[PDB]
Amino acid sequence: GLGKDHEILRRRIENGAKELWFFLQSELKKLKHLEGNELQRHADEILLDLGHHERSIMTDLYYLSQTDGAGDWREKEAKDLTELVQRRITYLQNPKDCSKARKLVCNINKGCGYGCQLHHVVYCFMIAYGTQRTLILESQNWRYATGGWETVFRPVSETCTDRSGLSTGHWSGEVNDKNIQVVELPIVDSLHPRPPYLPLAVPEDLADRLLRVHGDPAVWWVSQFVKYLIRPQPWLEKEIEEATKKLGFKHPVIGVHVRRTDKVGTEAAFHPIEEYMVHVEEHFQLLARRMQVDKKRVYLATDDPTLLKEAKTKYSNYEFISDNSISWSAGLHNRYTENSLRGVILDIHFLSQADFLVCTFSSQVCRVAYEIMQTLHPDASANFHSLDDIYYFGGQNAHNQIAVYPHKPRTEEEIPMEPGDIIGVAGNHWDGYSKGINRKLGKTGLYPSYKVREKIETVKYPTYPEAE
Amino acid sequence: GLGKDHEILRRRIENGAKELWFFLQSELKKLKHLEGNELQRHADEILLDLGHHERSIMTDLYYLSQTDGAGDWREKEAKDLTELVQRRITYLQNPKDCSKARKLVCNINKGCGYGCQLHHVVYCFMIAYGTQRTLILESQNWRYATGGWETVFRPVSETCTDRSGLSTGHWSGEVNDKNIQVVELPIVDSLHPRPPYLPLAVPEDLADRLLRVHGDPAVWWVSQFVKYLIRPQPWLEKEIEEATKKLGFKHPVIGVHVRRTDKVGTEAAFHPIEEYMVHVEEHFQLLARRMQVDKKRVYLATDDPTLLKEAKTKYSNYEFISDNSISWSAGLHNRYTENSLRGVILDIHFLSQADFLVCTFSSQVCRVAYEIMQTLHPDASANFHSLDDIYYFGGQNAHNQIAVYPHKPRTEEEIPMEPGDIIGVAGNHWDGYSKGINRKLGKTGLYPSYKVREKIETVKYPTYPEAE
Ligand SMILES: Nc1nc2c(ncn2[C@@H]2O[C@H](COP(=O)(O)OP(=O)(O)O)[C@@H](O)[C@H]2O)c(=O)[nH]1
Ligand SMILES: Nc1nc2c(ncn2[C@@H]2O[C@H](COP(=O)(O)OP(=O)(O)O)[C@@H](O)[C@H]2O)c(=O)[nH]1
After folding, report:
1. Partners of residue B387 in chain A, C-beta under 8 Å
2. Strands of A356-359's sheet, edge to edge?
3. Which of B37, B68, B99 finishes a domain?
4. Topological domains (Lumenal): residue ranges (chains A, B)?
5. Residue B328 C-alpha from the chain's centroid
6. Residue span of the structural domain in which B30 resides
7. Which ligand is located closest to the Cα atom of residue A339?
8. What is the tally of structural domains in chain A?
9. Would the CB atoms of A50 and B26 count as touching at under 8 Å?
10. CA–CA gap between residue B112 and residue B114 (Å, rounded)
11. Within its chain, how far is the Cα of B442 from the centroid?
12. A contact residues 339-398, partner B, Cβ 8 Å cutoff
C-alpha cells in the first residue's frame, strides 16, 4: 500500500509551501508601503526568515526521497546499473586476441590542464565504446608525468594496449572506417565528421532506468568512463588513504574549489572567498536540520597558496581542511610536474567525496569532481552550487530544453515561450532566470528557469550482450 | 520498486522550489533598492510571477499524490475505513433487545442554530460510542421542526428509539454510571466530568490507518457521525436529486458560504464578496493547470438575499448557482421552521459536494459542509480556505501543537518557541503567522505557522468486534 511516513511528508511539504505563499503575500504587501531604512531592514528580515522556511521544505523533500525503502531501492538500482556499464566497458577493453581487435587510438597530449586532458580521454573512450573499438591510450611524454598514464592509474586494458593492426587510418566517419582496424581520433575540436556518441546524450537502452534513479543522466554517463579511467595504481590508492588520515577528512564536509591564477582574465572571473562561503554556510544550515554538525568542515582546493590563511581568518568558526603545499605545486611555475599532477588528483578526490560542492563549473577541475561524485551515491546530481556555468562537457552537442509553461516577456531582455518550444540554454543565472535562444523564434534572452524541462537526448549505443 | 513518474515529479518539485528560492533572493534584493510607485509596481509583478510559480509546485505535488496507483489505494483504504466505522455505528445503534440496552439520552433543543445543534448531536453520539451506549435522540419541539428529527432525517436507530430502562441518572462520569442503564447527557458546556471521547482526538485503533489516508483525522472522525446522522428521509432525498437537476450543479464548481445577518457584530465580521472571490479565482487558476475549465462555477450559499445580484454583476465571467429563495427563507424573522431547515440542508449539501470550499470557519454552516466533504473523497482535508477561524469543534479539548523549529521573537507580538514546546493554537492568520499560547512559558502571541506540527491525540475507544 502507501507508506505512513511518505504520506505525512508529502502533506507537510504541501503545507509548508502553502505557509510560505501565505507569508510571501503578506510580507511583500507590507514591504511595498515602506521606505528608506525601515524598507531595507524589513527586506533583510524577510530574506532571513525565507531561508529557514525554504530549508525546512527542502529538508522534508530530502526525507521524502528516503522513506519506505526508497533510499535502499535507489542504491540497489544505481549499483546495478554501474556494475552493468563497467562490465560492458571492461569486456570491450579486454579482447582475447589483441592482434585482431578493432581499436581506436587516443593521444593524451592535448595541450591543456589535467581536467581538460582527462575529459579528452573520456571523449575518446565514449566514441570507442560507441564504435565497438578497444580504446588504445597513448600517453608517453604526458606533460604531467612523461612516464604516462600508468604513473598514477591502471592501464585502460589488461590484454590489449598495442596499436597494431592490418589497417590504420585517421578518423573519417563510422561508415567509411567500417573495415579499418585501427582508427586515430583527434581532439574534439578537430573532429570531422562528428559521430553521435557525445555528451550530453545517453544510451537509449539505459535512458528509462536512469530516469527512475538519477537527476542528470548525461553526467552519470560521462562519470562511468571517468570511474573506469581513474582506477588507482596500488601506490596511489595508498597515498589517498594516507592523506585521508593525515588531513582529518571526515563528514560532514563541504568541498570548495577556488580557481585563480591564469583562469582569471582568460576564461573565468575572480571570485572572492565570501562568494563561495555564502553557499557553504547556506548548505551547512540545511545539513544541520537533518544531522548534528559538530564542526563545519570545508575541504578547500585552490591554486592560490595565499587563500588558506585568508579563509581561516575570515571564518574562524569553520575548520578548513586543505593541503597548502599542494596549492603551492599548482602554481604556474610548477604545474606540469608529477608532484603537481598528484596534488590535483588528490584535491579532486576529496572534492568529489564531500557532501556538497561549491565552485565554478567553468573549471574542468570542479566538473571532474562533480562527475566522480556521481559514482559515489545513488543521485548526487544536485549536490553542487556553481558560481557561473551550468554543467557542461567541452565539445558536447547543443544543450536544449523544452518550454512547458508559456512566458510573456516583461522587458526586452526576456524572450517569449510557448509550451513545446525548443530552448537552447546557455546558462542559469541562479536568480530565477536562465539565458538561451528560443529556436522556434530565433530570439535570444532571459526566461524563468522553472518554465522549462530538460530535453534528454538518446543515442543507439551498442549494448555488448556478450559481457554478461 | 520506484515509479518513473514519482521520481521525475519529486525532482521537479525540488528544482521548482530551488528556483523559487533563487528567484526570491534576487527579487527581494532588488526591491530593497526601490521606493515609491516603482517599488510597488515591482512588488505586484513579483507577486503575480510568484503565484504562477507556486501553483506549478502545487500542481506537481498533486500529481505526485496520484502516481503509481496511490489514488486507487487511497480510495480503497478510505472506503474500508468508513465502511468499518459506519458498520460499527450501525451495530451500536440497533441492539436486539431495546429494553435491556444501555442508552445515552440526548436532547436536540440546544439554544442555537442548525449547525450548532447538529454538532451537539454529534457530541452526544461520540460520547455514546465511547461508552457503548445506544444513542437516544429526543427532538420534540425542535425549533426547526416541531415534529422532530424524522421530519428530515431517518431515525438514529431501527430497533431502539425508546428511553426506557431499569435505572436512569444525569451524567456523573463513566465510572459512577457503570451500572446505570439510561444516562442523560447535557450540553457540553454543562458536562462534568468530561470523558475522553471528544474532538479533536481520534480512536487509537484507527489513528495509524487514518494518517496513511487523511490529512486531518480529527475532522474525519467527526465526519463519520455526521454522515450517519444526515441519512435523509425519502422526500428530502428526492428533493436533493431534483435541486441538482434544476440548478445545473455540475463540476468543476467552488462552494462559497457568505454568512452575514446576525453573525456580524457578534461572533464574526462582515466580509465583502470581493474577499471570498480572490480565493475562488486563485483556486480556479490552480485547477486550470491540470484540467480544462469550461466555465467557472460557484455555488453561492448565503443568508443575505441581496448578494446573488451583486455577485452576478461584479463577476460577469462567472456562473453563480444559487437558490435565492432559500437565501430568503434564512432571514432572521422566519429562520426557525421546516422550509428554512430544508434550505440550509440543501445549501450545506451542495457546499459539501463542491471541489473547493471558501467561507468563514467561524460559521457552523461551513464546518458541517467541510465535514461532510471529508466523506466524499479520500482526503479533502485541505480543500478549503477560511477567511477567519481554523477548523474547530464546539466543546473540543484544547487544540495543541508541538513546536518543531525554534523561534526568537522579532517583535513583542511574537512568542518564543523551542523544539518540544506545547503550543495551544487559537488561530491561523493566513499570513505566515498563527496565534496561540506557549504553554511552557505561559505567553500568548504570534509564531510562524510552519514551525509547529500537529499533536494528534488518541483515545482508547471500544472497537465493537461483534459488528463484523
Ligand atoms: N592541486 C590543484 N591544482 C589546481 C587547482 N586548480 C587548478 N589547478 C591546476 O591547474 C589546472 C587547471 O586546468 P584544468 O584541469 O584543465 O581546469 P581549468 O583550467 O580550471 O578549466 C589543473 O589541472 C591543475 O593542474 C586546485 O585547486 N588544486
Ligand atoms: N439556507 C441557509 N441558511 C443559512 C445560511 N447561513 C446561515 N443560515 C441560517 O442561520 C443558521 C446559522 O446558525 P449555525 O448553523 O449554528 O451556524 P453559525 O451561526 O453561522 O455559526 C443556520 O443554521 C441557518 O439556519 C445559508 O447560507 N443558507
Report:
1. none
2. A318-321, A296-302, A253-258, A356-359, A384-386
3. B68
4. 1-468
5. 25
6. 1-68
7. 1
8. 3
9. no
10. 7
11. 29
12. 382
